[PDB]
Amino acid sequence: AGRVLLDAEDVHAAKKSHTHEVATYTTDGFMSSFDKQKIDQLVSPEAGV
Amino acid sequence: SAKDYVDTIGEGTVIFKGANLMGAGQSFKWDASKLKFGMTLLFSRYDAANNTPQDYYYHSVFLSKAQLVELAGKGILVQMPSTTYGDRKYLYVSTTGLSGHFDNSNYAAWALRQVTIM
Amino acid sequence: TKIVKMSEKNEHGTLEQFYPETHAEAVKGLVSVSEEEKTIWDQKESTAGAEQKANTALNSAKDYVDTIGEGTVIFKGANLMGAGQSFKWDASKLKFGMTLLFSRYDAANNTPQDYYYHSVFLSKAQLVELAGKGILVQMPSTTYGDRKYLYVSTTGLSGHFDNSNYAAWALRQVTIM
Amino acid sequence: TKIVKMSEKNEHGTLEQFYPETHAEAVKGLVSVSEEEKTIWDQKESTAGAEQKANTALN
Ligand SMILES: [Fe+3]
Neighbours of C135 (CB within 10 A): 15
Complete edge-to-edge strand list for the sheet that includes strand B74-78: B28-29, B97-99, B89-93, B74-78
CA distance A10 to C86: 65
The 3-state secondary structure of chain B reads CHHHHHHHHHHCEEEEEEEECCCCCCCEECCHHHCCCEEEEEEEECCCCCCCCCCCCCEEEEEEHHHHHHCCCEEEEECCCCCCCCCCEEEEECCCEEECCCCCCCCCCEEEEEEEEC
Residues 6+ apart with CB under 8 A from B92: B73, B74, B75, B76, B98, B99, B100, B101
Question: Does C177 lie at the interface with B, CB-CB under 8 angstroms?
Answer: yes
CA distance D37 to D26: 21
Identify residue C87 by its one-letter amino acid code: F
Output the CA torsion sign for D27, D30, D32, D33: negative
* A14 CA to centre of ligand 1 in angstroms: 7
CA distance C158 to C104: 20
Residues 6+ apart with CB under 8 A from C93: C72, C176
Integer angstrom CA distances of residue D43 from A16, C44, C131: 40, 9, 54
B65: nearest Cα among C66, C139, C172: C66
CA distance B113 to D14: 108
The answer to whether the beta carbons of residues C135 and C121 sit under 8 Å apart is no
The answer to whether the beta carbons of residues B91 and B26 sit under 8 Å apart is no
Burial B16-33 (b: 16+ CB within 10 A, else e): beebebbbeebbbbbeee
Integer angstrom CA distances of residue A25 from A6, A28, B113, C120, C135: 38, 8, 14, 32, 41
How many angstroms is the resolution? 3.3
B106: nearest Cα among B91, B90, B87: B87
**Rounded to the nearest 5°, which phi and psi values hold at C140?**
-60, 145
> CB-based burial of residue C49 (10 Å sphere; 0-12 exposed, 13-18 middle, 19+ buried)?
middle
Identify residue B27 by its one-letter amino acid code: S
Q: Please, which residues 74-103 of chain B have a Cβ atom closer than 8 Å to chain A?
A: 97
* B36 CA to centre of ligand 1 in angstroms: 30
The answer to whether the beta carbons of residues C140 and C118 sit under 8 Å apart is yes
The structure was resolved experimentally with cryo-EM
* B18 CA to centre of ligand 1 in angstroms: 27
Q: Does an interface of 3+ CB pairs under 8 Å exist between A and B? A: yes
Query: Is C21 close to D24, i.e. CB distance below 8 A?
Result: no
The answer to whether the beta carbons of residues C124 and C71 sit under 8 Å apart is no
> CB-based burial of residue A35 (10 Å sphere; 0-12 exposed, 13-18 middle, 19+ buried)?
middle
Using only the alpha carbons of chain D, give its radius of gyration.
Answer: 25
Question: Does B33 lie at the interface with A, CB-CB under 8 angstroms?
Answer: no
The answer to whether the beta carbons of residues A37 and B35 sit under 8 Å apart is no
Which positions in chain C touch B65 (Cβ < 8 Å)? 69-71, 177
Cα of B6 vs its chain's centroid, Å: 23
Query: Is B85 close to C144, i.e. CB distance below 8 A?
Result: yes
Coil vs helix vs strand at D34: coil
Q: Does an interface of 3+ CB pairs under 8 Å exist between A and D? A: no
Residue A12 annotated as lining a ligand binding site? no
